[PDB]
Amino acid sequence: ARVKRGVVAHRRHKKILARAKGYYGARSRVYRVAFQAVIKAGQYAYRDRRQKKRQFRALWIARINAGARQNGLSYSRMIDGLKKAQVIIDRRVLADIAMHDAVAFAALAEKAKGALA
């Protein structure tokens, strides 16, 4: 039962090289280099699934800060005031309202201010 390694080996190399399209030089042509390139890409993607949620929350907090400082507060005091008024809108929606609807955001800032005083 002599077994030849021609078809399965060729298909494995082919599948690894099909996942390396767009890479530069030997990284999309040479199996040894493309294999390390695909593994490192998977590692990077695993770590950036975690980092994406931090980056987006930082962006929401910055936009809410910009919106609150036009209404007379800092981010800290608006978030504290909204928590003291039992408003539970999260930051993803607050940043949306800051970026698209200035009147409703002024209403929210007034509610927070009233809660603080």
CA-to-CA separations, 37 to 15, 20, 52, 69, 75, in angstroms, rounded: 13, 7, 22, 46, 42
Spatial separation of the C-alpha atoms in residues 24 and 107, rounded to whole Å:
52
User: Which does residue 79 bind out of RNA, another protein, none, counting CB within 5 to 8 angstroms by kind?
Assistant: RNA
Rg (CA), the chain: 26
For RNA, what does the binding mask look like between residues 44 and 83, x meaning CB under 7 A?
xxxxxxxxxxxx-xx--x-------------xxx-xx--x
Which parts of this chain interact with RNA (CB under 7 A)? 1-4, 7-8, 10-11, 14, 18, 21-27, 29-30, 36-37, 39-41, 44-55, 57-58, 61, 75-77, 79-80, 83
